[PDB]
């Protein structure tokens, strides 16, 4: 049987060098250390789901330094404007091994 291991979800704001362009902003949601490889990631803004057109979820790949565990990315690209208005974005990660079968993280410019 495949062991159940909880995912760790870290949420990273766009890099400062990307925001200097004043074009679009990329928010990355990092899901690591989970088993089985099956994982669901969804993005929400203002308590409402975003169109899947706006983000891409990577396929879960094996974490090389932890054999039985996997990782995956979900990259959301919005605009620098919205990021810098103060909009709050939420990454929702669903996985079999989580206590409540779901967890979420939230980020904006004010975190750091």
């Amino acid at each position: 049987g495949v062991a159940l291991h909880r995912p760790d979800v870290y949420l990273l704001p766009p890099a400062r060098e990307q925001l200097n362009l004043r074009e679009s902003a990329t928010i990355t949601c990092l899901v690591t250390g989970f088993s089985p490889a099956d994982v669901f990631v969804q993005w929400m803004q203002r308590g409402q789901p975003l169109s899947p057109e706006k983000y891409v979820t990577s396929a879960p790949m094996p974490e090389p330094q932890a054999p039985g565990r996997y990782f995956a990315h979900s990259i959301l690209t919005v605009s620098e404007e919205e990021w810098n208005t103060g909009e709050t974005y939420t990454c929702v990660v669903a996985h079999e091994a989580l206590p409540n079968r779901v967890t979420e993280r939230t980020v904006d410019k004010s975190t750091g």
């Binding site: 060098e17 200097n20 362009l21 004043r22 074009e23 679009s24 605009s79 620098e80 404007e81 810098n84 208005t85």
Partner: protein, 105 residues
């Protein structure tokens, strides 16, 4: 920094000329959003068109004249404000000219 001022007609078009110093740099026009206190990109050679300007902006380059041209069509009153030509990966710091456009009915 140089300054120019433009006047356009509602529903008409305007052409903004900006200097083109280097061929292998980022070339952009930005709009100074007073609420944010920063200059947000309206068009660039990095395939970015602001949503409010989508379908209404064209960027053409003429290195033999050391200038690049930003033509804005289908003007609206919300376009009135202070803009800026620029180059580089920093939109606020890198700036070459200031353009003020007012759309008059």
């Amino acid at each position: 920094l140089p300054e120019v001022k433009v006047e356009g007609e509602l529903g008409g078009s305007v052409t903004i000329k900006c200097p083109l110093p280097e061929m292998h740099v980022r070339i952009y026009l930005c709009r100074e959003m007073a609420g944010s206190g920063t200059c947000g990109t309206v068009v660039s050679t990095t395939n970015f068109i602001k949503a409010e300007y989508k379908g209404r902006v064209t960027l053409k380059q003429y290195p033999r004249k050391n200038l690049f041209l930003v033509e804005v069509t289908q003007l609206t009153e919300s376009d009135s404000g202070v803009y800026a030509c620029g180059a580089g990966m920093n939109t606020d710091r890198g700036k070459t000219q200031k353009v003020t456009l007012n759309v008059h009915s």
